[PDB]
Design an enzyme around this catalytic site. Structure first.
Site, short mmCIF file in Angstrom:
data_model
loop_
_atom_site.label_atom_id
_atom_site.label_comp_id
_atom_site.label_asym_id
_atom_site.label_seq_id
_atom_site.Cartn_x
_atom_site.Cartn_y
_atom_site.Cartn_z
N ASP A 1 -11.28 10.73 2.36
CA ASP A 1 -10.42 11.89 2.46
C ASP A 1 -8.97 11.67 1.94
OD1 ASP A 1 -10.35 10.09 4.70
OD2 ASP A 1 -9.73 11.62 6.10
N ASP B 1 1.72 3.11 9.36
CA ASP B 1 0.27 2.97 9.15
C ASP B 1 -0.04 1.99 8.03
OD1 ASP B 1 -2.45 4.27 9.98
OD2 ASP B 1 -2.44 4.40 7.80
N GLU C 1 1.70 -1.55 11.79
CA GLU C 1 0.27 -1.60 12.13
C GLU C 1 -0.52 -2.41 11.10
OE1 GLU C 1 -2.57 0.74 10.80
OE2 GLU C 1 -4.01 -0.40 12.02
N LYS D 1 -10.03 11.08 16.47
CA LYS D 1 -9.53 11.12 15.10
C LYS D 1 -10.13 12.30 14.31
CE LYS D 1 -10.74 6.96 14.47
NZ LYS D 1 -11.16 5.82 13.64
O1 RZM Z 1 -4.09 2.91 12.45
C1 RZM Z 1 -5.36 2.92 11.75
C2 RZM Z 1 -5.34 4.08 10.99
N1 RZM Z 1 -5.04 3.80 9.51
C3 RZM Z 1 -6.08 4.24 8.87
C4 RZM Z 1 -5.71 4.82 7.50
O2 RZM Z 1 -4.69 5.82 7.56
C5 RZM Z 1 -6.70 5.42 9.87
O3 RZM Z 1 -8.00 5.91 9.36
C6 RZM Z 1 -8.24 7.21 9.84
O4 RZM Z 1 -7.67 8.19 8.90
C7 RZM Z 1 -8.39 8.12 7.61
C8 RZM Z 1 -7.73 9.05 6.64
O5 RZM Z 1 -7.53 10.31 7.26
C9 RZM Z 1 -9.87 8.34 7.78
O6 RZM Z 1 -10.56 8.31 6.49
C10 RZM Z 1 -10.37 7.25 8.65
O7 RZM Z 1 -11.82 7.29 8.73
C11 RZM Z 1 -9.72 7.35 9.98
O8 RZM Z 1 -10.18 6.33 10.90
C12 RZM Z 1 -6.76 4.82 10.97
O9 RZM Z 1 -6.82 5.74 12.16
#
Ligand code: RZM
Ligand code: RZM
Lengths: 649, 649
Positions: B345, B380, B409, B520
């Site tokens: 995404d 992030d 993170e 999420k």
């Molecule tokens: O602190 C960890 C976070 N850093 C990742 C990338 O933004 C996050 O990934 C989330 O967000 C992504 C993008 O919306 C999704 O594709 C993932 O499947 C979903 O888990 C994840 O929560």
């Protein structure tokens, strides 16, 4: 501006005092340059070492590899060339070709977007070819590009064309580097071979006299030089050769009052006859010295003079430069000490009234002996003089004469020992004589051959006139044979003090590391001829060890050293390697009982497979063996101290 | 000029990247400054730390002591004051009075030239007296001088007058320092309390909606805040609050295709409704956000916003700034990944075409949220963006706004985690969730409380929306109690993600650390009123832990932490101390079985000798015990996960 570059390169080693002092090497010496390198994301990095010589010319392409999985620690071996001040940097970069290959090797056999994948590869190899200077080399890559782009061949065929040994070879030499990022340069001081490698022999010229004239001269002492050269030594270290004070001269066996014709301690320097730039009258003249030096030189022997920055009460400095001494309220100067040792025959120098005059005079004296062929100085007790004084003195001398070698006799705490090496001392005495068990030797040599090798070059004297260790006292001749083997094979520089060959081991008293009737306080004539005829000398073993060292580059370096496990506490085993030269040594540390052991060789550390068995020659005996992952040894003290084997090809 | 000074001072610590980045502290935090200090000869040295504030003003006299016999490593504790950039140096010096006293205590009873020794002492104390400022302290020294010189008196009385407690006290304050030598200044970055200490709570505003409006707004989400403040939290961390993409939006349980009104992942930032400087239209407006921040402030809560530098395919940047993305030859942008995780995404940012443009917009965005009261950013996946990008961004923001806190993170390899802290991240996520056995916790915390604390401040989240560890899955409520106690007492900063208190512990599938029906990808309404009523929440335990933290300075620092031995592998025990506050914690890591154990306290580490017995109160129960070197504990899962004791006065 940021501290971290585009592709992070951090903590480059070796480093000494955070880059303020140079790491050290000698001509032809290899060592590892390492760094922490990684990038953002999941793609590959590469790295390489750029070693620059004193004119700034870069060495060969020197790619690094990750030293352990997941650690981001990378390293490569570099080799020091001509003497001088070098520098090294680590370059880090994105490695897109490795990344593309990883993915291409997977996606193409899976039929995933093969045309996209292959075009991306073609574009990478094109960028690679742009920076390839050799014309046939670019053509090799462009042919791969064209094959990558040939839509009329199957995808797998298109990919294979980009993975040929010929393509790999061009890319090995001229990789495509993304976002190349360099560390800040670090300094390397490269000095001559003898700074790292050499065999030392210490003796008192005055002991080599005649029936008629017991006090030897340079003329008579020169007679020992052929025997010393014949034993395979490179350097002759002489105790101080200057006039000796009469006031408070020490008598025999370190007694407080000299009587009669007692010769006193050579370290009690100075009289009306002269100071540190003069010759003891009983030794002869400066011309005699020149003669000795010339004769030493003809036999391949360099002279190392003791430089002991201290004065007998009779030294000219006491009245010419009173401010070079600390005076008590009644004007007297307290004698020097090294607790619990007392030096009642001497004054220590005070450095804080006239540090400049003392530095000026010190380098004048050194340059005097240098003019008379002395390019090595053994510095007596440097830890009782200011560290920055030695830093300054050594820099002054090496600035005009970089070949001069300074050896630090600092038996003291680790911080001071390390700092002295770090501020410029080419060599250091070490704790070697107090490391006698397998654990002590293994632990200590791991330290000396490890990080410390970056600023310190060890000189392993198996004895000195001040150090007859209990191991030699209790072990007799078998212990002497053992310590010589250890000293000779564990450090590229080792030494003995005259009489060691004869296994002289009578201590002053129980619990002492002093010799009875020490040569420090009396003439000590020796019957060299009789010992040779009666075979009561280990001179042949010493001779063999130096010959083995001269024939095996592995023993002429320090850093490549590995201990192999044995199943007996008394038996130690280790290997040293330099190019195709590998020497493996097994020593029985027990000087009284036969020890049998199994030696389990770390075969990959030797560049071998575990199932493999290899020919070795015991260089002490001429016997040939075949050694593998598990080898039986039986070492009988008196008959044989050790196996010193070369790996046969 | 020489690299080493008159009195060697070497290897001052803490040091970060050889001095190129600052060591860190926060206001009120203590830490040890250390150095290698020694001199030539055998006389005594002294050393002290000079800590200078942002205006260059030195702190109090802070004398050092040798940390272990024979090591020449010296240290003293210093304490950071106001925020800003400080510096520290170490001063080393000859300590002639200590030297003279040692000799005088020996020589005077021996009758060895006592007049001379006493006169040397007189001259020293005269020197010492000259620097002394106090009218009365100086006359105290001058009286000792006269007594030293009184030849009508016994040697022992003359000496004793120089050794009185009155004289000791003067010299302890104003020692006579010879040849003072200073290290080069090292930088220290002092930041606000919250950088080290605070309790964090992560929740999704959109889940705190209503029966009539399931998707929460900032106005409805503000009603969750009182309960959060009531649990004793200081920081609320919100996942991204921006519009969410529709192209390739993910469905429930991380499925590839969103259907109907699936709300998608908040981390898929951007739509035509706006990007990182915008608010999701369903969350409300910027005014509503301001109301939310104000309500947070009234309750003592700071907001931490998620900063995720990445884009949904619908983000305006995709077409406005195409060069911020890596395009494949067909023009497409490959979705982001964190292998084996896939983020279909979103597009990752490419940084090497327009690094300036990216940095400029990033700090513009951050400053936007800063203007609306956000003084903390949870960044992030910083490790898929250039390290130097963050160094630049953080330097730019903290340059104008030093109070802003960045939390990294980065669950990745150690080099990257460490490097991110060193280039400016005030806080770091850690391996905490993957450290669950006594050995793991002990080893990991020894690392975090050791040298790393000079550059890294850990934030112990016991869970995150991406991490439901098997320990919690298998252990149920008793395991949640344990990790809460561990997290709350081992780090001065800890956190939970909402639902933690309900003991949500159903994984996506066995072997996964993902939650089933993860918040999420869907609204996750929780009946907080019902959970509280039915006692199916550990919110009271959480509340008690934060209260205990607020009441015990020992739990609001990191570096003082000591593990004490127990006789059961499943029972861990440790202490933390700050000034007169000592906290003692014993935790049963077994969530299924009662554990009985003996806890053997290292009493000296508590500042007590081994036979003492001390009153403690378990702040979880109110019970008082008397504990000494060996203590029986019995910990029962579900009833007594642990003892959290304060040492009573
Ligand atoms: O602190 C960890 C976070 N850093 C990742 C990338 O933004 C996050 O990934 C989330 O967000 C992504 C993008 O919306 C999704 O594709 C993932 O499947 C979903 O888990 C994840 O929560
Ligand atoms: O490298 C060790 C040498 N460095 C010491 C001090 O100069 C030497 O001391 C000798 O020389 C001293 C002074 O002449 C005597 O007082 C000692 O008794 C004598 O042992 C010692 O041999």
């Amino acid at each position: 501006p940021t501290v971290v570059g585009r592709i992070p390169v951090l903590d480059v080693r070796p480093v000494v005092q955070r880059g303020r002092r140079p790491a050290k090497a000698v001509t032809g010496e290899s060592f590892e340059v390492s760094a922490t390198v990684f990038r953002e994301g999941h793609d590959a990095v590469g790295a390489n070492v750029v070693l620059r010589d004193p004119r700034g010319r870069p060495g060969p392409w020197t790619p690094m590899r990750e030293l352990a999985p997941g650690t981001d620690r990378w390293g490569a071996t570099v080799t020091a060339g001509e003497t001088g001040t070098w520098s090294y940097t680590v370059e880090a970069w994105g490695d897109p070709v490795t990344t593309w290959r990883h993915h291409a090797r997977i996606k193409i056999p899976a039929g995933l977007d093969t045309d996209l994948v292959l075009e991306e590869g073609a574009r990478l190899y094109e960028r690679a070819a742009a920076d390839v200077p050799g014309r046939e080399d670019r053509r090799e890559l462009l042919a791969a590009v064209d094959a990558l782009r040939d839509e009329s061949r199957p995808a797998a065929s298109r990919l294979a064309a980009a993975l040929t040994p010929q393509v790999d070879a061009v890319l090995a030499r001229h990789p495509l580097r993304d976002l190349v990022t360099s560390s800040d340069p670090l300094p390397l001081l490269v000095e001559r071979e003898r700074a790292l490698y050499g065999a030392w022999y210490e003796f008192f010229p005055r002991s080599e006299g005649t029936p008629h004239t017991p006090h030897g001269t340079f003329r008579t002492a020169a007679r020992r030089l052929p025997a010393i050269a014949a034993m395979g030594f490179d350097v002759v270290y002489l105790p101080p050769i200057h006039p000796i004070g009469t006031t408070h001269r020490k008598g025999r066996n370190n007694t407080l009052s000299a009587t009669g014709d007692d010769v006193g301690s050579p370290w009690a320097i100075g009289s009306p006859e002269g100071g540190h730039d003069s010759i003891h009258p009983a030794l002869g003249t400066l011309d005699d010295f020149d003669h000795f030096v010339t004769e030493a030189g003809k036999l391949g022997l360099e002279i190392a003079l003791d430089f002991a920055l201290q004065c007998s009460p009779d030294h000219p400095w006491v009245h010419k430069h009173p401010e070079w001494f600390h005076h008590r309220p009644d004007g007297t100067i307290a004698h020097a000490e090294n607790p619990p040792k007392k030096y009642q025959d001497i004054y220590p120098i005070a450095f804080d009234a006239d540090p400049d005059g003392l530095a000026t005079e010190t380098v004048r004296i050194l340059r005097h002996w240098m003019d008379h062929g002395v390019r090595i100085f053994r510095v007596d007790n440097p830890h009782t003089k200011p560290v920055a004084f030695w830093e300054r003195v050594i820099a002054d001398i090496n600035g005009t004469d970089p070949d001069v070698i300074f050896l630090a006799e600092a038996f003291t705490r680790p911080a001071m020992m390390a700092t002295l090496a770090q501020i410029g001392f080419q060599q250091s005495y070490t704790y070697f004589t107090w490391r006698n068990t397998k654990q002590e030797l293994t632990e200590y040599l791991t330290e000396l051959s490890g990080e410390a090798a970056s600023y310190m070059r060890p000189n392993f004297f198996a004895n000195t006139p001040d150090i007859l260790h209990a191991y030699l006292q209790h072990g007799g001749r078998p212990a002497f044979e053992v310590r010589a083997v250890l000293a000779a094979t564990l450090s590229p520089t080792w030494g003995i003090y005259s009489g060691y060959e004869l296994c002289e081991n009578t201590p002053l008293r129980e619990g002492s590391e002093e010799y009875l009737d020490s040569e420090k306080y009396q003439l000590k004539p020796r019957d060299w001829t009789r010992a040779a005829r009666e075979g009561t000398t280990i001179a042949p073993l010493v001779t063999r060890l130096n010959t083995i060292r001269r024939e095996n580059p592995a023993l002429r370096q320090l850093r490549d050293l590995h201990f192999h496990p044995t199943d007996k506490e008394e038996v130690i085993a280790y290997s040293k390697r330099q190019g195709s030269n590998t020497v493996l040594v097994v020593v029985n540390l027990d000087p009284r009982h036969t020890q049998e052991a199994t030696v389990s060789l770390d075969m990959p550390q030797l560049g071998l497979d575990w199932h493999e068995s290899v020919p070795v020659r015991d260089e002490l005996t001429g016997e040939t063996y075949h050694w593998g992952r598990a080898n039986y040894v039986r070492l009988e003290p008196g008959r044989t101290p050790a196996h010193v084997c070369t790996v046969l090809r």
